[PDB]
Amino acid sequence: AMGSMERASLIQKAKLAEQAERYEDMAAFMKGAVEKGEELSCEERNLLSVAYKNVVGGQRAAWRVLSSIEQKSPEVREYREKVETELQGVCDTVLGLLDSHLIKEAGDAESRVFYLKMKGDYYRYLAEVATDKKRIIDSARSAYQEAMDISKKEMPPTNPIRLGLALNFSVFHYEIANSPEEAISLAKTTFDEAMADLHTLSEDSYKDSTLIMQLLRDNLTLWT
Amino acid sequence: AMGSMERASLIQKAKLAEQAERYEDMAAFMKGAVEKGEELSCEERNLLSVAYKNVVGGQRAAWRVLSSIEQKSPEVREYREKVETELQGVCDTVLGLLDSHLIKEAGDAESRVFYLKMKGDYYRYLAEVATDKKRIIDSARSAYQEAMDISKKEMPPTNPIRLGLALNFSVFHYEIANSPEEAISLAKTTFDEAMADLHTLSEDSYKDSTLIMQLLRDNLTLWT
Amino acid sequence: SLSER
Amino acid sequence: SLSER
Numbered sequence: 001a002m003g004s005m006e007r008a009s010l011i012q013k014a015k016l017a018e019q020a021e022r023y024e025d026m027a028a029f030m031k032g033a034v035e036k037g038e039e040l041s042c043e044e045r046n047l048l049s050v051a052y053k054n055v056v057g058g059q060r061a062a063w064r065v066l067s068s069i070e071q072k073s074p075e076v077r078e079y080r081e082k083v084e085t086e087l088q089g090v091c092d093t094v095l096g097l098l099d100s101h102l103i104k105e106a107g108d109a110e111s112r113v114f115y116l117k118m119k120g121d122y123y124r125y126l127a128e129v130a131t132d133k134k135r136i137i138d139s140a141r142s143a144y145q146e147a148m149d150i151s152k153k154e155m156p157p158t159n160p161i162r163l164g165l166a167l168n169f170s171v172f173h174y175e176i177a178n179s180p181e182e183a184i185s186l187a188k189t190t191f192d193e194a195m196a197d198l199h200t201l202s203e204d205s206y207k208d209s210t211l212i213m214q215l216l217r218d219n220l221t222l223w224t
Numbered sequence: 225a226m227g228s229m230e231r232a233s234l235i236q237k238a239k240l241a242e243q244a245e246r247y248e249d250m251a252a253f254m255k256g257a258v259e260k261g262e263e264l265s266c267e268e269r270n271l272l273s274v275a276y277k278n279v280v281g282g283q284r285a286a287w288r289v290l291s292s293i294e295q296k297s298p299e300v301r302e303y304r305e306k307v308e309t310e311l312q313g314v315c316d317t318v319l320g321l322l323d324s325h326l327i328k329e330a331g332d333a334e335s336r337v338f339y340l341k342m343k344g345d346y347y348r349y350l351a352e353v354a355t356d357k358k359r360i361i362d363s364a365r366s367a368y369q370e371a372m373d374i375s376k377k378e379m380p381p382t383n384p385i386r387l388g389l390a391l392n393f394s395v396f397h398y399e400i401a402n403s404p405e406e407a408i409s410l411a412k413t414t415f416d417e418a419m420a421d422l423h424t425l426s427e428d429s430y431k432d433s434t435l436i437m438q439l440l441r442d443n444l445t446l447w448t
Numbered sequence: 449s450l451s452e453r
Numbered sequence: 454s455l456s457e458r
């Protein structure tokens with residue numbers, strides 16, 4: 001629908017939708033921008049990510065409420081299936097954008113890592129509702145692992161995209177892959193390597209890094 | 225779209241959507257139920273009201289963010305107009321249900337008061353974005369005033385629908401009609417008359433009434 | 449101003 | 454478990 005709007009206007013409107021907490025609009029605007037065919041800037045990648053994370057986040061939270069009602073106990077099943085189908089469509093939409101053609105056109109390591117992390121995240125969301133499920137778990141693991149390999153070669157241990165990747169990969173291992181010791185080992189080594197690197201950072205970079213490290217520590221606390 | 229679903233299923237799904245905080249679904253389910261043509265129970269009226277109050281509430285909050293951005297400073301105007309149009313459509317949808325044919329078929333005083341209060345509320349929401357605006361203000365005032373007249377004849381001063389009506393009519397006077405002394409007088413007399421009636425109430429009814437009285441007091445505090 | 453919640 | 458916010 002957004003094909004007749006200028007790229008710059010779509011980006012501006014995505015920023016306004018964020019301020020208005022209109023995340024479905026935000027995602028539609030950023031989808032439009034992606035489909036203009038130009039690579040995305042760092043700020044634009046973040047806008048894309050924030051929009052769809054909030055949309056799918058609301059769907060996941062709804063799905064969990066309905067699934068828990070369903071299990072205690074046709075309407076509940078029927079309405080969970082409806083929400084589940086909507087969530088799968090959103091994930092398919094994101095993965096479609098990544099595959100046509102954000103990833104292949106991502107020359108830089110930081111762009112390619114960002115998009116591969118997203119691919120893992122949206123397969124992860126698909127895995128949460130899947131039962132085939134095995135194929136989806138493997139697709140998530142492979143995307144995450146390819147992002148890790150690039151990130152370890154090309155980015156420092158405190159880089160916020162590398163840290164956010166390692167955080168989410170560790171959650172995958174713990175929540176999806178039934179590999180809690182893998183999750184704990186990844187979070188711990190990620191945390192220690194970033195810690196030993198904080199001395200190189202400005203006050204701004206320091207704030208970025210220690211914010212995500214706190215999430216890693218929180219999970220290690222819940223997991224052990 | 226909901227025409228092929230049983231009335232009972234739509235009601236059950238509206239309750240599930242509330243638990244899932246899926247208020248747009250909730251409103252679509254309750255619209256479907258209304259259009260079955262049967263009168264609504266007290267619980268069903270509350271479901272209808274809660275669904276659309278949350279939907280339109282999110283739209284109003286978005287509209288206010290965008291309008292404030294617009295004034296400080298074509299995209300902002302264009303996106304505020306888009307949100308504004310969506311909000312008007314939701315209000316037109318509610319007013320359509322009330323007029324075809326909830327109000328005319330509302331035999332009981334309590335049903336008719338509930339629906340007339342809603343009519344005032346959704347004209348009030350239309351008035352907030354209108355600039356014609358005068359006609360909308362008058363339509364809200366007349367609906368509210370007809371609800372007040374019935375409520376004073378047919379319901380006690382502590383009845384929660386009568387109190388919620390008086391609360392919202394007082395907000396209309398203060399925020400829409402530029403009649404702050406009317407607002408203050410209505411809130412005060414409503415509060416005092418309910419106070420003098422609390423002695424007749426059970427512990428349950430007492431909790432209903434004093435909850436809305438607290439809202440009246442809060443506004444009197446902000447207004448004077 | 450607060451309205452009926 | 455908490456993920457990247």
Ligand SMILES: N=C(N)c1cc(-c2ccccc2)c(CNC(=O)c2ccc3cc[nH]c3c2)s1
Binds near residue numbers: 042046047050211
């Ligand atoms: N509009 C947005 N949502 C963003 C725009 C940019 C941006 C803007 C200009 C250039 C490059 C990037 C972002 C970079 N992310 C953050 O700063 C960030 C991320 C997560 C958290 C959690 C607490 N604080 C945080 C800050 S996020």
Ligand SMILES: N=C(N)c1cc(-c2ccccc2)c(CNC(=O)c2ccc3cc[nH]c3c2)s1
Binds near residue numbers: 205207209211
């Ligand atoms: N190489 C780096 N370290 C960065 C370069 C740029 C940049 C690149 C181009 C233009 C302007 C800025 C950055 C902007 N911040 C983020 O992307 C970001 C993302 C997520 C989180 C979570 C906590 N903090 C966060 C920061 S970080």
Ligand SMILES: N=C(N)c1cc(-c2ccccc2)c(CNC(=O)c2ccc3cc[nH]c3c2)s1
Binds near residue numbers: 266267271
């Ligand atoms: N599903 C819903 N949302 C409701 C179902 C029924 C109902 C159920 C059975 C019979 C009759 C009515 C409702 C009656 N309203 C309340 O109880 C009420 C209203 C406002 C507030 C604010 C704090 N507490 C409140 C409680 S609300």
Ligand SMILES: N=C(N)c1cc(-c2ccccc2)c(CNC(=O)c2ccc3cc[nH]c3c2)s1
Binds near residue numbers: 270432
């Ligand atoms: N005549 C009365 N006093 C009531 C009769 C019934 C009733 C009627 C039929 C079946 C079951 C219950 C009531 C159910 N409560 C509400 O509608 C209500 C609505 C809003 C608020 C805000 C705070 N409390 C609230 C309660 S109140």
Ligand SMILES: [Mg+2]
Binds near residue numbers: 006007
């Ligand atoms: Mg152009």
Ligand SMILES: [Mg+2]
Binds near residue numbers: 107
């Ligand atoms: Mg390239």
Ligand SMILES: [Mg+2]
Binds near residue numbers: 230231
């Ligand atoms: Mg039937």
Ligand SMILES: [Mg+2]
Binds near residue numbers: 329332
């Ligand atoms: Mg009747």
